[PDB]
Specification:
The PDB classes it as fluorescent protein. The entry lists the keywords fluorescent protein. It forms a monomeric assembly. The entry is titled "Crystal Structure of Full-Length Split GFP Mutant E115H/T118H With Copper Mediated Crystal Contacts, P 43 21 2 Space Group". The protein contains one helix and eleven strands, in the order E-E-E-H-E-E-E-E-E-E-E-E. The chain is mainly β and 226 residues long. The protein has a single domain, classed as Green fluorescent protein (Green Fluorescent Protein). The chain has an eleven-stranded mixed barrel with strand order 1-2-3-11-10-7-8-9-4-5-6. It binds bromide ion and copper (II) ion (2 copies). The site of bromide ion has 5 residues, from strand 4 and strand 9.
C-alpha cells in the first residue's frame, strides 16, 4: 500500500506530454506496463496532434524511473518508489549542443491503480534546419548511465548526464541533461547514497499504426553500491 510495496508485480502506465518547441505545439499519449522486479518497461506512444515537430528519440528521457530494478542490497537507496503513491515532481533542463533547449516539468504518481507521468515541455532557441527540427536523428537510442545523487537541501535527488544521439550523417548530437526530483507529499522518503542507473532502450514501429508513433522497450538496473 506504500512505496516499494506498490511495485511487487506488473503495474499499468499512462503518460501524457504537452509540448511546445519553437511555437510548434504537440501532444503525446503513451500507454503500457512496467515491472520493477525485472526493470522492464513496455510502452507505445502516439502523437495526437499529427506529425511530431521533433524526433521521437529526443523525447525518450522525458517520457518513470520508479520502474528501475533496484537489487535487494540497494533497496534503501530507491527514492523513486519511496515517494509513492503521492509521487514526485521531475524537472529537467536539456541542452542540445549547438542547438536549442528543452525545459520539462512532470508529475509522476499513482492515479488509482495506474502509474501516471504527466509532463509539460517547452523548447526554445532551436535551429529550424538543425538536427532536431530538421529531423536528422537516427531512430534508435543507445545505452546510458545516469548517476543519481541526494539533494538533501530539498529531500530529493539530482542527476546530470549526457545523451548521445546518433545523427544520420554519422556525427553525434549531444544532449546535456540536468535533473531534479522533489517529493509531492511530505511523508518521509529514502535519500540515497551516490549510485547510477544503467539503461537500454529499443525503438520500433507498429506497421498497422497510421499516426506518428513510437513503440518502446527498456531495461534499467541500479548499480554502484556493494
Ligand atoms: Br533543472
Ligand atoms: Cu490501464
Ligand atoms: Cu481515472
Amino acid at each position: 500500500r506504500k512505496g516499494e510495496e506498490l511495485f511487487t508485480g506488473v503495474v499499468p502506465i499512462l503518460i501524457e506530454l504537452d509540448g511546445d518547441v519553437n511555437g510548434h505545439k504537440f501532444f503525446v499519449r503513451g500507454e503500457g506496463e512496467g515491472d520493477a522486479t525485472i526493470g522492464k518497461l513496455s510502452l507505445k506512444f502516439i502523437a495526437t496532434t499529427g506529425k511530431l515537430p521533433v524526433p521521437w528519440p529526443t523525447l525518450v528521457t522525458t517520457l518513470v524511473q520508479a520502474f528501475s530494478r533496484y537489487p535487494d542490497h540497494m533497496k534503501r537507496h530507491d527514492f523513486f518508489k519511496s515517494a509513492m503513491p503521492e509521487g514526485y515532481v521531475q524537472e529537467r533542463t536539456i541542452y542540445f549542443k549547438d542547438d536549442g533547449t528543452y525545459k520539462t516539468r512532470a508529475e509522476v504518481k499513482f492515479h488509482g491503480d495506474h502509474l501516471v507521468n504527466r509532463i509539460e515541455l517547452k523548447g526554445i532557441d532551436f535551429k529550424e534546419d538543425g538536427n532536431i527540427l530538421g529531423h536528422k536523428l537516427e531512430y534508435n537510442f543507445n545505452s546510458h548511465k545516469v548517476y543519481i545523487t541526494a539533494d538533501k537541501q530539498n529531500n530529493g535527488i539530482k542527476a546530470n548526464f549526457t545523451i548521445r544521439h546518433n545523427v544520420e550523417d554519422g556525427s553525434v548530437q549531444l544532449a546535456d541533461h540536468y535533473q531534479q526530483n522533489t517529493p509531492i507529499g511530505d511523508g518521509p522518503v529514502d535519500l540515497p547514497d551516490d549510485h547510477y542507473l544503467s539503461t537500454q532502450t529499443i525503438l520500433s514501429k507498429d506497421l498497422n499504426e497510421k499516426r506518428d508513433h513510437m513503440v518502446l522497450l527498456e531495461y534499467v538496473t541500479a548499480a554502484g553500491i556493494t
